[PDB]
Design a protein around this ligand. Sequence first.
Ligand SMILES: C/C(=N\NC(=N)N)c1ccc(NC(=O)c2c[nH]c3ccccc23)cc1
Ligand SMILES: C/C(=N\NC(=N)N)c1ccc(NC(=O)c2c[nH]c3ccccc23)cc1
Lengths: 281, 281
Amino acid sequence: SVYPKALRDEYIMSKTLGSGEVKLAFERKTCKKVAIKIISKNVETEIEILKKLNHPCIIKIKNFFDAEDYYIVLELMEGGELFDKVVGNKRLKEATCKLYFYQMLLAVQYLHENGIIHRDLKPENVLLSSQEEDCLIKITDFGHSKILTSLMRTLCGTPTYLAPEVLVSVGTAGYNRAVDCWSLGVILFICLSGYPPFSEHRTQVSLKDQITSGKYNFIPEVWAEVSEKALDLVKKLLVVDPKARFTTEEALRHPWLQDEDMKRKFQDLLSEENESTALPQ
Amino acid sequence: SVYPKALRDEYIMSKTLGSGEVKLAFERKTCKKVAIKIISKNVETEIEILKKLNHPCIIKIKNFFDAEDYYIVLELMEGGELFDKVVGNKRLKEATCKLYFYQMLLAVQYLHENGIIHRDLKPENVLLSSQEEDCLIKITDFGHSKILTSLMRTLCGTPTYLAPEVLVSVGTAGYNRAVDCWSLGVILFICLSGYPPFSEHRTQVSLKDQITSGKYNFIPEVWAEVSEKALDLVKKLLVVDPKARFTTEEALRHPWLQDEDMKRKFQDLLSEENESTALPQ
Ligand SMILES: C/C(=N\NC(=N)N)c1ccc(NC(=O)c2c[nH]c3ccccc23)cc1
Ligand SMILES: C/C(=N\NC(=N)N)c1ccc(NC(=O)c2c[nH]c3ccccc23)cc1
């Protein structure tokens, strides 16, 4: 098939960047590069979520076409997926993991403050701004995300007719956001060590049993070169009890992220990317 | 304020039947009585749910007006709420409880087969067709109801990044419908005995603690006149484990409901209410 006419009106389509499919395109009016995500036939509400979110580590949408397929136009992240930096046991310098992880926490903290849970945080969904190692990252793919009440309404009446499982669930409600902090923990683990913590490689313990017990695969030799603070943070994110698990605020206050050099590097990358109008004093 | 013009066009409004508010009205075209529920400002989707459901023990919607307030036009249930038959420790003959309860089970079975959970089953929400003791009942008020998938999508990938609480919840998912069977249990308890099983009258045990332990208030003297089969069914519905609790199918197969006299009386009331066109053989 062809591209829809309304898209072609505004953009010149070019090469595939990844595969769902992401394409390079050029905005006709500006002659600037953009990325165009094609989702074949809540994409509707992924759009609404992304329209309303405004954070430098969250992907922004420039345009949207609902045709034979869906076309989502985004700013181009030249660096590609974080995934490609961690396959084949490739490993990032610890300093680079911190820079990237700080940005992911800031992103996910912003989501949670704004009532959004992502639910599919993984290396595939973290984009890099450039091929340089020090860069901005942006979180993408809000197709599984959830907007954070039915329990609350039930509890305003007397529970004369209310089932016991509803009352038992009051203990744990309101912690759905913690699934994102677990995923972040897993991502940090992979970045620091170049391998996944839960996996069916070697071992007879099922993947499910590894995850629900929280018994991650620790290989000392791979970790010897990783600092203790780093691994400590990983341990506080991979807590099995969602109520005890570190939140993004607690992670941002952890010793490993009290690194004014890394923060400076982040601030420097931010202002480098920004094109502001004049300011009064 | 006044009634909206589009309503007045079709109906002549009359007296209050109950209080939210329910009014007697007359359809101009037929000169027949109807009931009009006024909900002041998912009423939208309560309408869609009710439009698509077709069961003789579920209230049918005749019309709907979305104005200053919402107006829902329904068939008139002259008998009023089941609530009024059980306040002040009034008690229904056991035979009448069975007739009514059979109808409630049939209704709720129909909902569950069609992917609908009611979530607010109570005497207030069961309507009687007439002031006669043997009558049809209809379940109403689908304002808290839910249409029965996010878990299922999560489980089609590998759970490398998936939080342990999601995997633990696979054990219990798909049993939300059981909240309706608990409520039915509580309603049957009230109907048979004229008092509620969980209540803050006398006792120092909190309502919550009574419900989650399943320790209903049993007063032998009130129950002596109730059959053992009846109480047995109540016990199988007020099971605290939602997976072990009786479903509507299991309740319909219980000895207490194997009563061909009651069933005949129900069939007789059905055909009495129906106005069918001629039939070929
Ligand atoms: C919103 C979204 N998905 N939503 C959904 N699936 N429901 C989405 C997914 C991937 C990209 N990828 C990219 O920009 C790139 C991925 N690999 C790349 C390599 C080079 C440049 C850009 C990308 C951008 C947006
Ligand atoms: C659909 C609904 N509510 N939905 C919602 N609240 N979201 C509804 C609630 C109550 C009635 N009541 C009745 O028909 C009567 C209640 N008491 C009566 C006494 C005499 C005759 C009729 C009724 C009918 C419909």
